[PDB]
Design a protein around this ligand. Structure first.
Ligand code: TRH
Ligand code: TRH
Ligand code: CL
Ligand code: MG
Ligand code: MG
Ligand code: MG
Lengths: 603, 601
């Protein structure tokens, strides 16, 4: 009885990525006999099919099959879905990887809640967030929130196989189709799929490769956009779900070219896509959709229907550079957490303040008179929107690429009158980091982490790395965790845990005049200078001794321990049975990171 | 009568720089028969001496003589000085150039005021200022301010030849001596030299191109020799106190700040012990009274040998700066108006703070360091009104820098949170570009704007910046002016279409374009532009039919006219018969627009 079937369409697959893919599947905690691998090669010109057969020699649950070239992976996925015999289907691309506990966690969550679709937390290489809203916390009954529960609509979820067949849910293999997973996930919800969101564990890694061009030209792009919008209006029968998909895709893909997109494209490309977007808004988008959009997007929709492209270009110049960068006001360790105080304000490129202007009873967007004398009065009136600001912290593992919201933060955003009638938008936030909240695999215990802040307001979303101007290096030894918060070479805030990029002995310093040598016991005690120590810690390492002067001598390897107790830290070096006379260099090697403290001892 | 003798020592001279130097001399407005050239070759292992006398064939007043290699240009200058015969002497290095009106302006200034030394305004390739204090306005009685009037003490001044001989003032002829011109300029002042500061015109260009004093032991042997020279030869209390204070602060205390963070520990311990010994042996205690709080802290910890506290203080001070943002920029009448703001920060991020306790405004320091220092040295209370905030401008081609005058500024110490106080500044100023155009080349040049902020011992002179897009054009009295945010995000003023096309940035009204078949004049009005006064710029345009792929272009004549607060371009079709739609690009001052203009003829 097979629980999970892994559908993998392959075509000229990069071998190293294929080896990583096979590795991540082998590392699954689920028993290998409870799952199966269904590979379907899309007629690879290279030796991809021969390699897939070589992988299948040592794995009896892996089934390989080759088909004619089809151009995309929807047909290979369909053939593999019919060959598959597991309760749940995962559509894994040939250049992605799966986290080691995904199968057991996802199946248990779906089986216990009788889920037809398990939308598990997905990780991407770049960016500070992915599925920030949906991958917040677990939701066994996510379909009760509407079709939004399936966003982001990648095919990298788990689908109950019998549910797909009972409703004839396949991939669009009739022709080349952009966003084929939006059709797929939407069809699932249209047929009443019980959807659950598994957000407490990274299930899938969507890897960026650089080699990742159909639809790049403007005509096939808007041909697929018209095809996707028609599908929404024709297949989605629930009004709330239809209005959501219409609003979400009109805002992101149609109105999404009416802002900064206008400043990085030539005129003849703008005209083709502006006219395409104008006809689509008139023919397919009802007017009530824009009535529940934000002020700035209402302006874009209004001018689009007027054909006022020149005003949208001028607005794009006015809006260029708006952002919110957070500065570290304070950063320190207290007990077993790292504490932060951050501040931010809306600016143009971390420089002069962004302003809104107060006129009588309205807080208005600052616009030229030519543009204001064309828009409805309410479209640039931010008065009723000044209480929707959010200011939150996030974290990203530099190895796993997984991103998380940091819970428990305290933030506040004020609108402050700076000069005359101009108002700036200021934020203050304090939060703490408990690194155990984000360590889910064993590999997470040794990793550098990067801190970011997420600010939203007046339609703007700014998710940037946390930064600081002054030098910042602070260390901690907390319950067997070496921790270093520091300003990296880019001026951003990083947190090394487990000596993955820095040495805690180097960054803490050594009280070199306080080093103790016990000749009879052979112990050398090296107390650390500046470090926050909480709880008991013992990390085994080693040290190397070299005679001073004899620059070519073999290193004398010797046991060493990094100890944290009574709020103090030290490295104990054990000379053991080594007979030593003279002066020696001493270099500690804790967790693979050596120090540069120039330690010399005389024996 | 030879008015000026130009002394030039050469050794393995780069040929293209030697050509630029000679051309710099031939372009002088002074009669060539009133100056002479004295080139002394310090045993060049290249062929520059042969190429020197090549230049002496067509130039009669150029004397060229070779000596054995002395190692640096002290002996070649002394040999050229003796065999020279001019009234004033300029020491011109073989890789520098001199501005065209320098000889005339400097000599007239020295003759009219009987100056022994004319300290002309000097220009360097990099930086936002040079001689910011001394090169303000012209001063024919500069020696009345003290020895300070000769700073910066480069050898690139004009010295009366009679004065140097009547006092045996030469360069040190022995082994290499660092700051050879500080001895020279000091010895000139000690003998009561009539010093004049010519600041209204850039006279000398000290060029940065692609050494003794690199090892720490010889460095501090030279620093010791320099300080002993001041104490032994300077006889006026005010002059000695100045040179001691200035060089103790810049070269001795100057290694006790950020220098500690970009050097290895073994060199730090060498120079620190040298600096501590020199302060104890040569620097009286009262000199430190003339210093600011931060330098008084440095001096105190130096004399205590507390290098570790100095290292900690260096990390705390690392990154303190003041960047100015543009709050407003507009054209009014014949000038460009600016409004900027700044605050002291770390790397233009979080604020720099000072902390209030009782009635004291204190530098924020760790308790371990404050306990080691006298209370007054970290109390800023008496310094809270000593802030300067001024604008500056730099020609990108001439590399000349000027202070922009007429500015209004105001720096405030503001309570931000609890008892923390930040330092905020605001400034208004206008740019009259006529103030900085002195040579014909200065009319077509991009100008870079910067701001100068000082306070609490810190100096921050860096380019002005803006975040939002800024492009504003003006046509003011035959000057095309475009203030803009450059690719680096810094404020630049293009004058004369040196970088940007004014038509492309002004915008063209493609519906008000007129095509007059009677006279054959296509009028292309400009949209967003500022027009003051009357102006007319000659140019040309280019035609090409829309249909043909690579049709030969048809060139014409265009003109950029500014009148009645309006600017327009007039294209003259000439006598060519044309038919159909034609592309049309303009070319005013060598800049073609990208407006994609079509006319149906
Ligand atoms: C090209 C192709 C792919 N496939 C399979 C290979 C994978 O299993 C699956 C998905 O392909 P991937 O390259 O992993 O998808 P991707 O989403 O990572 O790549 C995409 O990024 C866009 C930004 C670029 O325009 C394209 O490179 C596009 O393919 O499709 C076929 O089966 N047949 C084919 O002919
Ligand atoms: C070496 C040498 C130079 N000279 C001349 C050449 C110049 O006219 C003058 C000074 O040399 P310049 O290269 O013009 O120096 P400079 O003052 O322009 O720049 C200096 O900057 C210092 C930071 C470097 O350590 C020096 O090596 C030098 O590059 O001395 C001699 O006459 N004889 C010599 O043997
Ligand atoms: Cl530029
Ligand atoms: Mg992929
Ligand atoms: Mg030189
Ligand atoms: Mg900033």
């Amino acid at each position: 009885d097979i629980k999970i079937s892994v559908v993998v369409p392959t075509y000229n697959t990069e071998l190293e990525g294929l080896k990583n893919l096979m590795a991540s599947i082998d590392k699954q905690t689920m028993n290998p006999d409870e799952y199966e691998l269904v590979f379907v090669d899309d007629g690879s010109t290279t030796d991809t099919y021969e390699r897939l057969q070589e992988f299948a020699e040592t794995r009896p649950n892996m089934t390989v099959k080759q088909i004619e070239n089809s151009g995309w992976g929807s047909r290979p996925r369909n053939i593999a879905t019919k060959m598959a015999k597991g309760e749940y289907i995962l559509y894994l691309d040939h250049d992605d990887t799966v986290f080691p506990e995904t199968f057991e966690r996802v199946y248990n969550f779906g089986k216990e809640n009788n889920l037809d679709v398990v939308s598990g937390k997905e990780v991407r290489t770049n960016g500070w967030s992915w599925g920030w809203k949906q991958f917040s916390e677990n939701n066994p009954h996510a379909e009760e929130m509407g079709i939004e529960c399936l966003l982001p609509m990648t095919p990298h979820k788990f689908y109950k196989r019998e549910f797909l067949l009972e409703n004839d849910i396949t991939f669009d293999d009739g022709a080349r189709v952009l966003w084929e997973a939006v059709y797929f996930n939407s069809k699932a919800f249209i047929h009443g799929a019980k959807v659950g969101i598994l957000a407490d564990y990274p299930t899938y890694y969507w890897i960026a490769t650089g080699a990742n061009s159909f639809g790049r030209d403007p005509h096939e792009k808007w041909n697929q956009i018209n095809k996707l919008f028609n599908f929404f209006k024709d297949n989605i029968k629930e009004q709330r779900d239809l209005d959501f998909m219409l609003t979400h895709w009109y805002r992101s893909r149609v109105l999404g070219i009416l802002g900064q997109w206008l400043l990085k494209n030539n005129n003849e490309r703008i005209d083709i896509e502006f006219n395409y977007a104008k006809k689509l808004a008139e023919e397919l988008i009802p007017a009530y959709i824009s009535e529940n959009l934000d002020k700035n997007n209402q302006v874009k929709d209004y001018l689009l229907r007027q054909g006022d492209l020149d005003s949208l270009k001028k607005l794009a110049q006015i809006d260029a550079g708006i952002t919110a960068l957070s500065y570290v006001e304070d950063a320190y360790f207290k007990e077993d957490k790292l504490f932060f105080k951050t501040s931010t304000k809306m600016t143009y490129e971390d420089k002069e303040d962004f302003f809104i202007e107060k006129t009588a009873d309205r807080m208005e967007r600052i616009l030229p008179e030519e543009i204001k004398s064309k828009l409805p009065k309410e479209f640039f009136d931010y008065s009723d929107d000044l209480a929707e600001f959010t200011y939150e912290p996030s974290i990203k593992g530099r190895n796993s690429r997984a991103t998380w919201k940091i819970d428990g933060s305290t933030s506040n955003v004020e609108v402050v009158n700076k000069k005359a009638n101009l108002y700036k938008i200021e934020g203050e936030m304090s939060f703490s980091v408990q690194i155990n909240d984000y360590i889910l695999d064993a590999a997470d215990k040794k990793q550098p982490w990067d801190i970011a802040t997420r600010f939203t307001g007046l339609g703007y979303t700014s998710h940037r790395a946390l930064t600081i101007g002054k030098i910042l290096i602070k260390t901690a030894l907390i319950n067997n965790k070496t921790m270093i918060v520091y300003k990296n070479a880019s001026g951003l805030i990083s947190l090394d845990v487990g000596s993955s990029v820095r040495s805690i002995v180097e960054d803490s310093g050594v009280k070199r005049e306080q080093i103790l040598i016990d000749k009879t016991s052979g112990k050398v005690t090296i107390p650390l200078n500046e470090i926050h120590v909480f709880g008991e810690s013992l990390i085994e390492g080693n040290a190397e001794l070299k005679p001073v002067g004899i620059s070519d001598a073999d290193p004398i390897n010797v046991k060493a321990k990094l100890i944290g107790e009574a709020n103090k830290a030290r490295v104990e070096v054990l000379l053991g049975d080594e007979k030593l006379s003279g002066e020696y260099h001493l270099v500690t090697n804790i967790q693979g990171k050596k120090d540069k403290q120039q330690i010399k001892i005389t024996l």
